Symmetry: C3
Subunit: 671 residues, 3 copies
C-alpha cells in the first residue's frame, strides 16, 4: 500500500466511493503514513498535513485553543475530520496523531462523497485511519522531548488471536507534559486508544475507541489591530501576548463500530455507528487590542465551557454490474448525525471587567490575578443532519475512461434554548460528476464538478424577512488535473475554481421599508497546484510543491469590498521537504530539511492592513539501527530554525505570533 | 585503574583510610579522570563534578566571584577541597583543573576520615589528585577557544629520570584570556604547576606546587527580590545584571610535600605538609535589588580585599595484623591547619553610596563611573584547627565483611582583631562506623554512620548567655547503599538522612528576661540516589542518574518556617551524559549529548518565592586521529544549546542568571 | 593553474608585468577561483577577499550604499578595481562576482605596475578576471536562498565554435531579490554578462560586456557619535538604524576589448579599450546622530544622484632577449582614463529639514514619510589621467635571481563647473624596484620599493598660495617577504612600511602673514603578515593568517593628533578558514568553519572614542555528487553564527552595525 519512501500511501478513501488508487482518483488526494507522522514528531494534525502541502495554510501559532488550517484557501474546521470515513468522532479542536495509521486529505468540497460535516466547512476533508494489529506481535516504546521542558512517552502494542489470526488488538497510550517553546506556555496531552478487528470469511467488524486530553497553560488567543493605529513590528517569536495564567482544556472520548457483509462479489452491505463527547473549558483573554504604535495592549477577559454529546451513523450498499463493455461500480448510503450541547460563559467576568493594560514588547507584563472559573449556564443547543446518496462509476475501454455520477440529498436542523425565532429543518440536493482518463498506465487526466454544503444562516429580527432560515448553501468547485506516476516519484498538476456564498443584511434592498437578509455574498478561489512525492533517486525522498491562489471577494455587503483579496491566506506558497539516507556503521542516517515560503496576507477585507510573507526553515536527523537485534530509532528536529518572528491571522482575532524555534527529540525501542 | 570508557576510575581516597576500590568503599564515591576533564573542556571543578552527578547541584552562573555547588543538598565550600588528601592548599574560590589526574567526590560528611575543613561545610569532600610523570616521555599542546572571544593554550610535559625511572617531573602551563559568553564579561585564567616524585625501595616522596590566577571583568554578583515586588521574568541568558566595570581577581599559590616510610609490610608512617596564599580583590556591586515588577534594579557598591596565609599538616601511621580469622587495617593520624588573614573593604564606598539605578531588561544600562580601588584595613583574623583520629577496619570471611570503626578529636579556635568578646578553643569528638558486605565479587551492600563538623558560633552581647562559644556542631548522616559492577557498566543505589544543626538568638526562650542563643535549629535532608557509569554496550558511554531529595527545615527560629523546604536546591534531578563512537576514515568520531533536568527551587525559607525547574541540553563532537603518527584530538562543545534563560540561587544574593549558550573548541597535539 | 584544494590559483596579474607565478612574484598576492566564490556563496567582492585574508578589513555592515574594505590598513576604493587588468570598467560601488573566473589581490600600492586608478587609493589592487568558454560545452543552473527571504538564480553557459574551437561564447545571468537578514532591508541584484574570445594563430581578441543592478531598500548609512555623549551598547545585530523607506540603487554597464599580437615568441603588442556608465541614486538619511546615552537618534535626510561616463585604454609591448647569461623581460605601455559626471543632490531637502527623532533600541520606530526624489543639478565634473611606463626584469641562473626596475610618468587633470580657481594638468614620475631570490624551488625571498599616487589637492582662496594645485602625491612602500610552497600548502611571511601623505591649510606656516597650504601630513602603516593556503593534510583545506598593524598618524595639522592610531582599522587580525572532506556514498561531504578575530578600533583621530575587538564564527557544509552523471552541489552556510552585535566604522559616518546571523543555501546542477 505504501509508496516508495514509506511516507505516503498509494490509495485513500474517497468518501462513500471507498478506497481508490492515486491514478484512478479524479480528485487531488494525499495520504501520509504513521512512519511520516513519527518522522516529523508531529504533535497535531496540522504538523502532518501542512508541512509539505502548498494547498494547505496555517497561521502556525503554538498552543492556540484549536488547530487552524485552510485547504485551497478556505477554512477546514477541526470539527469536520472523519475517522475511518465517519464524522463526529474525532477530537473537537486538536488531535494528537498517535492512534492513526494514515492521515488522508481530499482537497476541495466533497458533499456528494461525504455529506455535510458538523461545522459545514468546504476547504477539504481530512480522514484519519486508525491502527489495527499487524500479523506479527508488536510492542514499541517511544520517549519524547520538546523544548523547553516537555517530556512524554508513547506505547504501541498489537497482537492478533485465533487459529487464523482473525481477531486483532492494537493499543496506544501516550502522555506528555511540561513547558513548551513559548514563554510561560506549557502543553499536556494524553491518549489511550483501542483498535479491535474481526476478519470473517464473508464479514468484517472494526471497533475503535479513544480517550484524549489536550491542555495548554498560557494559551495563545491573539490580538486585534485598527487602521488608525496599524500593525507594529512583531515581538520576538517566543513572546506570549495573552495572559500567562490563561488556560484551555479539551477532553475528548470517542468510539465507533464498522460492519461489512459480502452477499456476493457483486454486492456488499456496510454499517458504521459511533459517538463521542467533548468537554471544552477556557479561562483567559477574549481579545487583546493594540491601541498604540508604542505597543500598548488592552485585553478583555472571558470564560467559556461547553459540553457536547455526538452520535453518527453511515450505512449502505456497494455493488458491481456490466452493460456490454462498460463496468459499473455503485454505492448507495444513508447518514445521520446528532449532537446536544450546553454552553456556559462570561462575556464580562464580575470583579474582572476592567481591561488589563500591558505592552506587547514588555518582557515582564502584569496580567493580574487569575479569576476563579465559574461560568454560568447560557443556553442548550442541538444539531441534526441526515443525507441519502447514490453514485455510479462507469468504466469504458478496459477501464481507461472512468465517469462518476451521483447525487446526495441533505437535511439539517439546529435549535437553541435562547432562540425565540422559528426553528425548522431545511434541505438541499447536491450533484457531482468526475471524469478520469488513463492516457497511459502512468498518466491520468481528470476533471470534476462537485459541491460543498454549509448550514443556512437565519435572518435577524431586524430584517424584512425576520427569522427566515436559508437552505444549505452550495459551495461549487470545478477542477481540471493531471497525475503522473513515474514509478517511485509522482506529480500532480491541478487547477480549480471554487465559489462559496455568504449571507448578510443588505440595506440597499428594501422590503416593507426594511433591510433584507440575502445570500448574495460570494468568495471565489481560483488556484493552480503543482505537487509531488516519493523518491526521485535512490536514498532521497522529496515532497512538496507550489501553488498560486487568487482568493477574491467577488460580492460583498454594499459592494464596498468587491474585487478585494480574502483575509488570512497567502496568494503564493512554495514548500519542499527533503530527506537523504546514508549508511553509517550498523544503521541508516537520514538528514532532513524543510523550507516553507509564503507571500503576504491581508488582515482586513478592506485590504488596508496586511502582513508580509515569511520563509521558515526546519532541519532534522534520524538514526535507525539495532541493539541486540531490537530496532532502535533516534530522531532530532528543529522547527523554525531561524526563529523568525511573524504575525499571521488566527481564528476570531486579527493577529498572532508564529511558533518560535522549537527542538524535538525522540527515541523509540521495539521489544 | 580506569574503568571501561576511560572517564571514571575504579578507586578513590577515602580520607585517612587511603585508597579503596569502588566495591570496597562503604560510601558513595566517584572519581573522574583527566580524560573526562579534557573531553568536557572543563574550565572549573563544577564543570567536572556537576555535569552528570544528580546529587550535585550548581546555580550554573557564568563568571561568579566563586564556584558554587551543593552535595546531597548541602553547601560544599570551595575552601574545603583537598589536594592529595590535604586541606588548605587548593585555590580559595575557583580552580581550573589542568593540573589534576583525578577529581574525586565523596558524598556526605566525613569528619572521621578528613577532620574539619576550613569553612566547615558538610555536603561532601572533593579531592584533587595531581599529575605525576608516567614512564614514557610525554608532551601535549592544546589550543582552546570559548565564545565569544576567549583564546588560550595548555602545555603538559612529563619525563622520568634515573636508571630505574625513580624520579618524575610533570609540568603544566595554561593561559586563557578574552570575552566570555556573557555580555561585557571577560575571563582570564593562568596556571603553572609542578609535580615531582621520588619512588625509593621503602620510601616515597611527592612534591606539588602551583601558581594560579583567576580574573573576571563583569563578574556576576546576583540580585535580591522581595515578596512585595516578586520575581520578574529572567532577561535573555547572556545579560549581565552587575556593573560592566566590576571585577574580581584571585591569586593562589600553593605547595605541599608528602612522605611515606615502610618499616615493614605491616607498618607504614606518613607525613604531609603544605602551605598556600590567597589574594582576593573585588570591585563591584554588593547586591542588586529588584525594586519594581517593571524590572527596576537598585545596585549598591562595595569593595573587598583579603590576604590569607595558610599552613596545613597531616601525619600518622597505618598498619595491618591478624587476630584469629579477623584481619585488621588501622590508621592513627594528627592534623593541623592555621591561617592568618587581613581584610580590607568598604560596605559604603565614599562618593558611591547611592545605589546605581538600572532596569534588568535594558540593553544599554548606565553603570556609572568605576570607583578607584582603595579599600581600607578592617581587621586581622586567624583560624586554627587540629585533630587526632583513630580507625580500624575489621575484615571477616575472606574480606567479604568489612567493619570500620573510628573516632576523631577536633579542636578549633578563631580570633579577630576587632572582637572584644572572649576567644577560646573548643573541641568535639566525632565517631564513625561503616559496614560493607560483598554479596558477590560484583555486588556490595553497605551502611554508614558518620558526622560533619562546623565551627561553633558565638552568642552576641545582647543574649542571656553573652559571648558563649558553642563547640563544633555535629552534622549526622545515616546511609544505606548498594553497588553493582556488571563488568563495563556500574550502578550505585543509596538512601541517606543527614541532619545539620544551626544556631540563632531565640526571643521565645527568656533567661533573666533576655533572649537566649541556642543551637536548636535543624535541617534534615533525606535522599535517594541512583547513578551509573561506564559502557553499557560497545561504542557507547553512559553516565548519569536520578535523585529525589527532601530538604526540610525541621526546627527554625520561633517555629515560623518549621516543615518548609530548604532554599536553593531542587527536590528532583535527572542527568544523562552519553557518547557514541564510530570509525570515520583514519580516526574515531565521537558524538556526545547531555541533559540536565531539575525541578523548582525555593528562594526564601518562608517558601513564598520560588523559581521553576529547567532543562538544559549540551552537545559535543570529538575527532581523534593521527597526523604523521602524532595523536591529534579535535573537540567541539555547545553548552546550554537552547540558550535557556533561568534564575537560580547563588551565594549571598537571592538570584542570578544561568550561563547562556557557550561554544567551546580545542585542538590537542602529542609531540 | 589552480592549487591543491581548487580554491586558490598559482598565478596572478602583476599589473603591466602580466601573469606571474606565486614564487616568481616579489609582491604579496593571492588569487581566488570561481570555485571559492561559489563555496562562500559570496554576494560581493568583500565576501571573497576579506573572509580569510588578515591584511584586509571590512566593517562588515549589511546593505550599505557601497562595499568598504581596507588593504594593509589603507582604504581600497571600489572605484579602483581592474577588469582583466583595465581600470574604469567594473561597477562603481558594489560588484556581484558571478561573471569572474578569478578574484586577484595585490597588496600595497602599485603605481609603477598599474598607474593611478580613478579614486587614487593605495591599499591594494583588486583585479577581476572574467569567464571565457572552456573547450567542453557547459551549462550550470544555481538557485540561491539567503535569510530571511531572498531568492535568486544564476545561469552560466559556455560553448566554443569553429573547426578548431577558436571562437568562445560565455554567458552569465543572475537575479536575486527579497528581504535580507536585517529587519526591513531587502536586496536586489541583477547581472547579464558576455565573454567572447577569438584565438587566432598570431593574434587574440577578448571582448567582455555586462549590465548590472544593485538595489537596497533599508540601506544602512550609519550614525555619528560625540565624546560628550559617548558610544552606547549596540542594539541587536539585525536592527536597521537608518530609515526603513531609505533606498539606494546603482546601475552599471561596461564593455571592454583586448587585442594581442605575437610578432614572435620574444615580442608581443597588446591594446585594450573599454567604457562604462554608472547611475547612482540615494534617497534616505545623510546621518543619524546619537544625542543621548539612552539611545536617542537624530537623523537628517538627503538625496543624491550622479551619472558618470567613463573611458579607458591601455596599450603597449612586452618582449624578452638575452645578453650573455642575463635574461631581460621588459614591458612598455601607455594608459588613458577619462570620465564625465553630473551630480544632483540635496544637503537639505526642502520641506524635510527637521531631523527625524527615533531611539536606536525602539523595536517599532517611526521614520516618517519618504520624500519625493527630486534632487536638483549641482555641478558637472571631469577627470583625465594618462601614463607611460617602462619596466625590465633582469634574471639569471634560470630565473632564480630576478631584479625588476621601472619608471612611470603619470598625468592628471580634474575640472568642475563650480570651480572658479585655475584648472591645470599636473605630473609626477614614480619608480619601482623589486628583487626576488629562489633559495630553493620551494622557497622565494623578495623585497620591493614601490609607490602609489593620489591626485594633488588645490590650495583654498584663504591660503598664502591660493589656487596652487599639487602634483600627484606619492605613497611609498618598502616590503620584505618570504614565500614557501611545500607542494600542496603554501606560506607567505612579509613585513612592510607604507607612508601616505595628506595636505591641509596650516596656520602655523605663514607666508605674507597668511596660512600656507602644505603636503606635510602623513600616515605610516607598518605591518607583519603571516598567511597560508591549500591543503596541509589530505582531505583538509586551511586558509588564513595573522597580522599586526601599526597605523600611525605621524604628522597632523597643528600636531594635535601626532602619534595617534588611525581610525577604523584594528591593529591585530587572526583569520582561519578550514574545510574537512569525508567520502560518503557516491559523493564528498565537506564541513567548513571560519573564525575572524580582530582587536579594538578607534572611532576618532583624537583616539578618545573606540569600539572593542570582536570574534565572529561561520560554519558551512557542502555535498558534491553526481545524479545520472550530472554534477550536483548542495551548499549551506551560516555567517556570524553567534549573532554578535558590534559597532564598526563605515565610510562618511562614525559607526554602523555589523551584519547579523545570516543563513545561505544554494543548489547547482550541470546540464
Ligand atoms: C551550528 C553547529 C555548530 C558546530 C560547533 C561549533 C563549531 C564552530 O566552528 C568554527 C570554525 O572553527 C574551525 C577552525 O577555524
Ligand atoms: Fe468565543
Ligand atoms: Fe562579602
Ligand atoms: Fe555624500
Amino acid at each position: 500500500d505504501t509508496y516508495a519512501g514509506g511516507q505516503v500511501a498509494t490509495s485513500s478513501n474517497v468518501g462513500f466511493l471507498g478506497s481508490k488508487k492515486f491514478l484512478d482518483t479524479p480528485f487531488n488526494t494525499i495520504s501520509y503514513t504513521d512512519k511520516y507522522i513519527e518522522d516529523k514528531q508531529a504533535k497535531d494534525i496540522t504538523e502532518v498535513i501542512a508541512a509539505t502541502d502548498p494547498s494547505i495554510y496555517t497561521n502556525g501559532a503554538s498552543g492556540g485553543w484549536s488547530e487552524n488550517y485552510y485547504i485551497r484557501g478556505y477554512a477546514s474546521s477541526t470539527n469536520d475530520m472523519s475517522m475511518n470515513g465517519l464524522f463526529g468522532i474525532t477530537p473537537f479542536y486538536r488531535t494528537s496523531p498517535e492512534m492513526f495509521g494514515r492521515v488522508e486529505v481530499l482537497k476541495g468540497p466533497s458533499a456528494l462523497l461525504n455529506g455535510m460535516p458538523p461545522a459545514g466547512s468546504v476547504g477539504g476533508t481530512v480522514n484519519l485511519v486508525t491502527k489495527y494489529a499487524a500479523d506479527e506481535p508488536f510492542a514499541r516504546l517511544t520517549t519524547t522531548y520538546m523544548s523547553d521542558a516537555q517530556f512524554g512517552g508513547h506505547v504501541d502494542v498489537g497482537r492478533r488471536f485465533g487459529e487464523n489470526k482473525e481477531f486483532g488488538v492494537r493499543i496506544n497510550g501516550m502522555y506528555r507534559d511540561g513547558d513548551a517553546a513559548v514563554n510561560d506556555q506549557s502543553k499536556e496531552s494524553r491518549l489511550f486508544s483501542l483498535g479491535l478487528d474481526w476478519q470473517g470469511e464473508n464479514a468484517r467488524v472494526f471497533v475503535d475507541a479513544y480517550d484524549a486530553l489536550d491542555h495548554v497553560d498560557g494559551v495563545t488567543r491573539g490580538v486585534n489591530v485598527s487602521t488608525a493605529v496599524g500593525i507594529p513590528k512583531p515581538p520576538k517569536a517566543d513572546t506570549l501576548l495573552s495572559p500567562d495564567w490563561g488556560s484551555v482544556e479539551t477532553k475528548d472520548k470517542g468510539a465507533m463500530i464498522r460492519g461489512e457483509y459480502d452477499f456476493s462479489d457483486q454486492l456488499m452491505a456496510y454499517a458504521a455507528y459511533g459517538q463521542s463527547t467533548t468537554e471544552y473549558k477556557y479561562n483567559g483573554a477574549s481579545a487583546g487590542t493594540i491601541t498604540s504604535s508604542t505597543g500598548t495592549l488592552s485585553s478583555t477577559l472571558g470564560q467559556l465551557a461547553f459540553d457536547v454529546d455526538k452520535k453518527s451513523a453511515d450505512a449502505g450498499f456497494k455493488g458491481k454490474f456490466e452493460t456490454g463493455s462498460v463496468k459499473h461500480q455503485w454505492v448507495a448510503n444513508a447518514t445521520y448525525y446528532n449532537h446536544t450541547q450546553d454552553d456556559y460563559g462570561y462575556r464580562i467576568i464580575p470583579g474582572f471587567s476592567d481591561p488589563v493594560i500591558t505592552n506587547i514588547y514588555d518582557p515582564n507584563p502584569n496580567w493580574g490575578p487569575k479569576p476563579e472559573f465559574t461560568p454560568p449556564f447560557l443556553f442548550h443547543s442541538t444539531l441534526s443532519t441526515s443525507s441519502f446518496g447514490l453514485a455510479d462509476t462507469l468504466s469504458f475501454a478496459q477501464d481507461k475512461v472512468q465517469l462518476t455520477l451521483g447525487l446526495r440529498h441533505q437535511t439539517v436542523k439546529a435549535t437553541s434554548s435562547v432562540n425565540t425565532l422559528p426553528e425548522n429543518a431545511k434541505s438541499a440536493t447536491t450533484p457531482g460528476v468526475a471524469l478520469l482518463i488513463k492516457a497511459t498506465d502512468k498518466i491520468s487526466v481528470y476533471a470534476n464538478y462537485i459541491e460543498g454544503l454549509t448550514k443556512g444562516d437565519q435572518a435577524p429580527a431586524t430584517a424584512s424577512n425576520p427569522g427566515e432560515i436559508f437552505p444549505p448553501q452550495k459551495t461549487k468547485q470545478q477542477e481540471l488535473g493531471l497525475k503522473v506516476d513515474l514509478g517511485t516519484f509522482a506529480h500532480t498538476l491541478s487547477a480549480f475554481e471554487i465559489t462559496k456564498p455568504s449571507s448578510y443584511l443588505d440595506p440597499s434592498k428594501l422590503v416593507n421599508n426594511l433591510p433584507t437578509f440575502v445570500s448574495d455574498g460570494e468568495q471565489r478561489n481560483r488556484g493552480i497546484e503543482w505537487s509531488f512525492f516519493g523518491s526521485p533517486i535512490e536514498h532521497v525522498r522529496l515532497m512538496g510543491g507550489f501553488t498560486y491562489l487568487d482568493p477574491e471577494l467577488t460580492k460583498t455587503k454594499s459592494g464596498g469590498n468587491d474585487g478585494h483579496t480574502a483575509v488570512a491566506v497567502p496568494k503564493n506558497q512554495a514548500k519542499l521537504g527533503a530527506e537523504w539516507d546514508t549508511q553509517v556503521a550498523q544503521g541508516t542516517l537520514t538528514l532532513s530539511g524543510n523550507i516553507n515560503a509564503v507571500s503576504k496576507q491581508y488582515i482586513n477585507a478592506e485590504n488596508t492592513l496586511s502582513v508580509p510573507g515569511r520563509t521558515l526553515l526546519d532541519v532534522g536527523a534520524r538514526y535507525s539501527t539495532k541493539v541486540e537485534d531490537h530496532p532502535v530509532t533516534f530522531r532530532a528536529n528543529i522547527y523554525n530554525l531561524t526563529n523568525k518572528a511573524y504575525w499571521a491571522q488566527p481564528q476570531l482575532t486579527n493577529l498572532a505570533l508564529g511558533a518560535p524555534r522549537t527542538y524535538m527529540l525522540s527515541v523509540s525501542y521495539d521489544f
